[PDB]
Design a protein around this nucleic acid. Structure first.
Ligand SMILES: [Zn+2]
Lengths: 202, 129, 81, 86, 207, 61, 206
RNA sequence: GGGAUCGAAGAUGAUCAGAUACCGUCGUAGUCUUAACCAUAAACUAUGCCGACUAGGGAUCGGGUGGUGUUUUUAAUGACCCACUCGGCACCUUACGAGAAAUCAAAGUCUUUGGGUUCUGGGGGGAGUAUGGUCGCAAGGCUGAAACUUAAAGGAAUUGAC
């Protein structure tokens, strides 16, 4: 690995944000009247295709082409910017596919202004856990399990999350934010069933 | 250890009828099964049926039309005298005026009403209504 | 589900069933014509042979038994009969 | 259901399920009756002209309802290639 | 009255005139005044009252001796209150009964058309057709239900813990309801399916 | 705004807000260089129905 | 049968493909193995869009039979469906329910929301289960938009489509409204496209 | 015969203290093995064996078939991936059904009562006692009453005093 030290600490903290502290990371490449030095790929992405000038502040040269990562849904083939927590969202915002977003290598050119994905030509698809038995809400079995006490507010006859706009989903995303802030100042969840749903748990 | 090929066949028909299916397959066939089905067909409880040859006792596919309430076998095949037929019909059938008890007699296989016209008796096989 | 044709199953669904559970039984093995690289003499081999079949002209071996289909030797040529 | 003089003596004659021929009882509140509009040759629905089907609560509860209705509608003219016998 | 449900409006307007329409189309009934006008001859019998800890539980049977019967159970804090509310529940549950002949079809039905059974809890009740002049061969509680339905001759058999009174009445009530479920060869004929009255008079029923 | 409260100055705006429609449809192929990107199995479906469309095929593999 | 003018046109086909209605996703129920054309190597299934058209017209012919239009109820609890059903109930005479259904709306008169529908149309049979269940207590038939994972109890006419994508939900409701107005006299001819754009039905987030 | 460890019996230390209220030391038979006996257990899934039907999904163990599949290597084989199938220990979903209920792929196809066949029970005690027989070196096993006495004993599931 690499040693963290009390001198290096601030740089390491920035690296864990995902920002390029080194400069020239993945760089592949009216006169010079303005230039921008920045280490954030999200800003760089906008700058390049608007035909702005980017400055490699580690070296003093303008950048024409760069390679980085973005998300791509393999169902509908649409491309999305990588969120700043650095992992996929659960649902595709276009087609509503569940878990279909994969991180994909991408290149950008000032010259063309276009965006190009790079695909692994020998990809093997994994299909473990795509299909499984799930309860139906209107079965006679379900109506017996529901019980005689009406809606139980503790252990709330749990219903699985399967849609983006299901009201159950709205709670978990905001509650996740709340628990984050509470725990961090005091110190100062998963959806679907995963691949192995079909293997019995003792 | 199939002790009765006839008992299996009517059991398959009952289970299909209860769930609402329109067809059923039964294995194996026999002469007795064919005769029994032909009686049921005459009175309108089942549609056509078809026999498949295989050099190994064959198979039957039966069409079902939804009229059948129950069919069943009586085992053992008790001996029945002409005076006794009136008792079996009282026990087995749901009413005085529909349904049939089925007999083997040396005059053939027939329902209990035909047996009275011809004035014959023999052994009980089963019932339909 | 409630209504289906039991007498005319589709060819594709019939091909995947177990050999005893099709509408009528039948084998799925077959026979081969086989030639060794040397001789002209053809011979007939059962696809699930249990013996190590030799050529007729000489004690060269054509196949070896396994748990299932027989393994034909190298250099042999065959035609499904 | 007729007396000796030939008079009818039923209260009423029940409806029967078009899928399975079962009698629909007077309190099978899950049963339904569907009306499909007839279509004029100019392509417009004719008022008060229907093709009608009835389904028992048993069939609907068991989830067979949709498959049964495809079959019935296709042997009438209402569908083309939705249902297959095999 | 001022009917609140769609069916109530058609009844008060006089568009529907016999209860056989309601049974034929299997429509739900929510307002007791509907039965009260279509079926005026209905009369009631009170089968049991007992105190419980204080509250009163009442069991009520209603019918007319001509093919319609209903059953209802209610608990209330006053004896008169339990009976009052018990009658309302019994009227809502009214169902038809099929009756027939033990033999040759001379002169009006007098018995059941088939053997039937019903079960509730441990108790089971079985009804068997009987020849004319047998009367009702049943225990006193079950005998009263069959009279108000209008059966003349029937044999009965029973099993289980018949001393629990309300399980016995419910089981018998299920058994007579099943009489219209049994398909028989004279019902094999094919019928065109009627149009519902809620279609025909749709504008009378609205608003 | 706040829950459980309404007044004309909201109601008048909401009926305006939800009448919005873009100038060019989001489904228009003009947004997609004039073609539909589809897999091999999708183009098989089209052929089975007949029709003729400006498809473009990705292998997916 | 309906005349050849009701066949699926090439222009409508483009709309269905552009909205991704043919993407059936995963976890296929055993019923609705019909309506499936084939599977991709990655595991997504292709819905037979030709059958989607056939069933949609059949559903339209059922709605057009109702004697007076306010007796049709359209329901969507999920938010992506809410603007769609509101627009549907404006161009047709139907009655919308959007948001919380409040149990006891078809049973329990003496309720402010009490209704007596003749027909119910549901956008998602798993989320709208309360409305489907209560309809079964009172002899009401049900039409549902169904994805390949949908349960099947008490639904009488399933329309197979992608039930998750925002554009898919809006497009299907749009096409239904067009077909009922065109089986009625409200649109003069089947040959001329309707002036309302599909986008009027789409969900709008910010 | 062997005899490390642990340890019925036995010989000893303390007898104080309410969470730690039963604790510490030594140790015979035994614990292992060879040759003969004994025939009991909550020996339990508290569910007799054989056969047919009503039901679907993907995980796993053994065998087989197919694939223009990946890797080992330039083939074969091995390991892995996808589809199918026979057999097995289990799981999830489903209720035409069953049940007093808890619950049940059988505990279903039973008042609409009959596929073949073996064993056992008939309110609670007296009592697995007495007596006869039989097996065993013994401890004991198998078979097995009556006089008399009594109004309950028992199963599952609800609500909740001081
Ligand atoms: Zn997508």
């Amino acid at each position: 690995g690499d040693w963290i030290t009390p001198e290096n600490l601030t740089e390491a903290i920035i690296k864990d944000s995902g920002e390029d502290t080194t400069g020239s990371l993945g760089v592949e490449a009216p006169e010079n009247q303005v230039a921008l030095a920045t280490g954030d790929f999200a800003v760089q992405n906008v700058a390049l295709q608007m035909n702005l000038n980017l400055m490699n502040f580690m070296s003093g040269l303008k950048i024409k082409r760069i390679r980085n990562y973005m998300l791509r849904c393999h169902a509908c083939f649409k491309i999305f910017p990588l969120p700043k927590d650095g992992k996929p969202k659960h649902f595709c915002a276009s087609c509503g596919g569940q878990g279909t977003l994969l991180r994909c290598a991408v290149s950008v050119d000032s010259r063309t202004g276009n965006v190009t994905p790079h695909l692994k030509s020998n990809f093997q698809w994994n299909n473990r856990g795509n299909r499984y038995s799930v309860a139906s809400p209107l079965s006679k079995n379900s109506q017996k399990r529901y019980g005689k006490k009406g809606h139980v507010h503790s252990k709330p006859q749990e219903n699985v999350i399967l849609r983006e706009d299901q009201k159950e989903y709205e709670k978990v995303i905001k509650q996740e934010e709340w628990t984050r802030r509470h725990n961090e100042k005091i110190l100062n969840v998963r959806i679907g069933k995963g691949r192995y749903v079909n293997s019995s748990k003792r | 250890t199939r002790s009765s090929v006839l008992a299996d066949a009517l059991n398959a028909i009952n289970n299909a009828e209860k769930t609402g299916k329109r067809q059923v397959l039964i294995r194996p066939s026999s002469k007795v099964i064919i005769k029994f089905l032909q009686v049921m067909q005459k009175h309108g409880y089942i549609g056509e049926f078809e026999y498949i040859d295989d050099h190994r006792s064959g198979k039957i596919v039966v069409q079902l039309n939804g009229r059948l309430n129950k069919c069943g076998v009586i085992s053992p095949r008790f001996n029945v005298k002409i005076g006794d037929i009136e008792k079996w019909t009282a026990n087995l059938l749901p009413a005085r005026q529909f349904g049939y008890v089925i007999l083997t007699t040396s005059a053939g296989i027939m329902d209990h009403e035909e047996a009275r016209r011809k004035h014959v008796s023999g052994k009980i096989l089963g019932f339909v209504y | 589900v409630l209504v289906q044709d039991l007498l005319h199953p589709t060819a594709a669904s019939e091909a995947r069933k177990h050999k005893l559970k099709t509408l009528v039984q039948g084998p799925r093995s077959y026979f081969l014509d086989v030639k060794c690289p040397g001789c002209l003499n053809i011979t007939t081999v059962f696809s699930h042979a249990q013996t190590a079949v030799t050529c007729e002209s000489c004690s060269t071996i054509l196949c070896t038994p396994t748990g299932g289909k027989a393994k034909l030797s190298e250099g042999t040529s065959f035609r499904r009969k | 259901m007729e007396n000796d003089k030939g008079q009818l003596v039923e209260l009423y004659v029940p409806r029967k399920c078009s899928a399975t021929n079962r009698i629909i009882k007077a309190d099978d509140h899950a049963s339904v009756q569907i009306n499909v509009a007839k279509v004029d040759e100019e392509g417009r629905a004719i008022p008060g002209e229907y093709v009608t089907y009835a389904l028992s609560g048993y069939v609907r509860s068991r989830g067979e309802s949709d498959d049964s209705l495809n079959r019935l509608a296709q042997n009438d003219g209402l569908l083309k290639n939705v249902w297959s016998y095999s | 009255w001022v009917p609140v449900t769609k069916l109530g409006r058609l009844v008060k307007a006089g568009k529907i005139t016999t209860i056989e329409e309601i049974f034929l189309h299997s429509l739900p009934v929510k307002e007791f005044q509907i039965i009260d006008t279509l079926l005026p001859g209905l009369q009631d019998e009170v089968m049991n009252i007992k105190p419980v800890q204080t509250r009163f539980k009442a069991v009520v049977v209603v019918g007319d001796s001509n093919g319609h019967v209903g059953l209802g159970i209610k608990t209330a804090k006053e004896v008169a209150g339990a009976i009052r509310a018990g009658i309302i529940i019994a009227k809502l549950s009214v169902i038809p009964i099929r009756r027939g002949y033990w033999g040759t079809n001379l002169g009006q039905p007098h018995s059941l058309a088939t053997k039937t059974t019903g079960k509730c809890g441990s108790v089971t009740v079985r009804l068997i057709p009987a020849p004319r002049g047998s009367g009702i061969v049943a225990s006193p509680a079950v005998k009263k239900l069959l009279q108000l339905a209008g059966v003349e001759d029937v044999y009965t058999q029973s099993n289980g813990k018949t001393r629990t009174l309300e399980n016995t009445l419910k089981a018998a009530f299920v058994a007579i309801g099943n009489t219209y479920g049994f398909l028989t060869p004279n019902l094999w004929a094919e019928q065109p399916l009627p149009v519902s009255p809620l279609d025909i008079y749709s504008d009378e029923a609205s608003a | 705004p706040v829950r459980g409260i309404s007044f004309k100055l909201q109601e008048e705006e909401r009926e305006r807000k939800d009448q919005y429609v873009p100038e060019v449809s989001a489904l228009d192929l003009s947004r997609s260089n004039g073609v539909l990107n589809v897999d091999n199995q999708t183009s098989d479906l089209v052929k089975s129905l007949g029709l003729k469309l400006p498809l473009s095929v990705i292998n997916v593999s | 049968s309906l005349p050849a003018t009701f066949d699926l046109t090439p222009e409508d086909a483009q709309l269905l493909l552009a909205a991704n209605t043919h993407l059936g996703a995963r976890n296929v129920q055993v019923h609705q193995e019909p309506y499936v054309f084939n599977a991709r190597p990655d595991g997504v299934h292709v819905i037979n869009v030709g059958k989607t058209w056939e069933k949609l017209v059949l559903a339209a012919r059922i709605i057009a039979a109702i004697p007076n239009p306010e007796d049709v109820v359209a329901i969507s609890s999920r938010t992506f469906g809410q603007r769609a059903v509101l627009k549907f109930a404006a161009h047709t005479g139907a009655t919308p329910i959007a948001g919380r259904f409040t149990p006891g709306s078809f049973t329990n008169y003496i309720t402010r929301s009490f209704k007596e529908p003749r027909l119910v149309i549901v956008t998602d049979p798993r989320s709208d289960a309360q409305a489907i269940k209560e309809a079964s207590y009172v002899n009401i038939p049900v039409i549902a938009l169904t994805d390949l994972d949908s349960p099947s109890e008490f639904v009488d006419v399933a329309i197979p489509c992608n039930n998750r994508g925002k554009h898919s939900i809006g497009l299907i409701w749009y096409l239904l409204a067009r077909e009922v107005l065109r089986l009625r006299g409200a649109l003069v001819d089947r040959t001329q496209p309707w002036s309302i754009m599909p986008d009027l039905y789409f969900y709008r987030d910010p």
